[PDB]
Structure 1
Amino acid sequence: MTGRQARAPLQFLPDEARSLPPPKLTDPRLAYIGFLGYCSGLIDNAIRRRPVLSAGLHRQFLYITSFVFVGYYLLKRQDYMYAVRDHDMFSYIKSHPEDFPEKDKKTYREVFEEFHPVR
């Protein structure tokens, strides 16, 4: 789905991204990114012949911090994009209400179907 008002260049975090609730502490996706950072540092120590689970503790801390930071900004952009998709959808509903009629919601007392007996 194309921009949609690139006037207003690429703008990694836009102005209206502060007009929506940001994600919070212990949300599961950033926790997944944090475990991904722990596994990143652990496997970094596993590349070279330095021992695993030791002697890379600042690398553990730096990789986990960096991934949580990056993933937090990515989550903010993600929720912005879904919100603007929602607003564009409902605004096109408002622009052409006539093209989308309410379907004939019959109750099942008057609905005829087929039966197709299995035996």
Structure 2
Amino acid sequence: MMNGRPGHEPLKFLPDEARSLPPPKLNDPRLVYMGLLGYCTGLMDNMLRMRPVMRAGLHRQLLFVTSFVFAGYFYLKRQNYLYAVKDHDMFGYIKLHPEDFPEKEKKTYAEILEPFHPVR
């Protein structure tokens, strides 16, 4: 739905506005989870091909980990940008259309009479 958003660049992974967002930590739980997925990928690769496990393909395992992290960093950056854009447009729309999102003013529990439902 955000494809028709104005200024939307076609096939731009990371526009220049996204550089104003803060990046990840590089210690994020999800990037280390992706590294763990890469390690398990190497382990499964060795298990399938009748190879030792945690001993055989240390260059392959390192490559799996690094590929997963090096992809997850940029994909997570893109997703952060997209969610930022969501909040941005939502805020702009409520600020442009306050008649539809009025300044509601709620009441207290002394003035409203909620009904009683015994258990007995």
In structure 2, the residue matched to 1:21 is: 22
Q: Which moved more, 1:5-14 or 1:67-76?
A: 5-14
In structure 1, the residue matched to 2:62 is: 61
How far apart in 1 are the matches of 2:119 and 2:56? Answer: 68
Answer whether contact 2:26 2:73 (CA < 8 A) is retained.
no
Two-structure CA RMSD over aligned residues (Å): 1.3
User: CA offsets, 1:13-54, max 9 Å, x none?
Assistant: 111110110001311010100100100111111111121111
Letter paired with 2:13: F
TM-score between the two structures when normalised by the length of structure 2:
0.92
In structure 2, the residue matched to 1:96 is: 97
In structure 2, the residue matched to 1:37 is: 38
TM-score between the two structures when normalised by the length of structure 1:
0.93
Identity of counterpart residues, as a percentage? 71
2:76 counterpart of 1:75? yes
How far apart in 2 are the matches of 1:77 and 1:7? Answer: 14
How far apart in 1 are the matches of 2:98 and 2:36? Answer: 47
Letter paired with 2:35: G
Answer whether contact 2:38 2:68 (CA < 8 A) is retained.
yes
How far apart in 1 are the matches of 2:8 and 2:61? Answer: 41
In structure 2, the residue matched to 1:84 is: 85
- Describe how 1:108-119 pairs up with structure 2 within 5 A: 108-119=109-120
Letter paired with 1:40: T
Structure 1: any 5+ residue segments left out of the alignment? none
How far apart in 2 are the matches of 1:86 and 1:2? Answer: 12
Letter paired with 1:9: P
For these two proteins, the number of residue pairs brought into alignment is: 119
Structure 2: any 5+ residue segments left out of the alignment? none
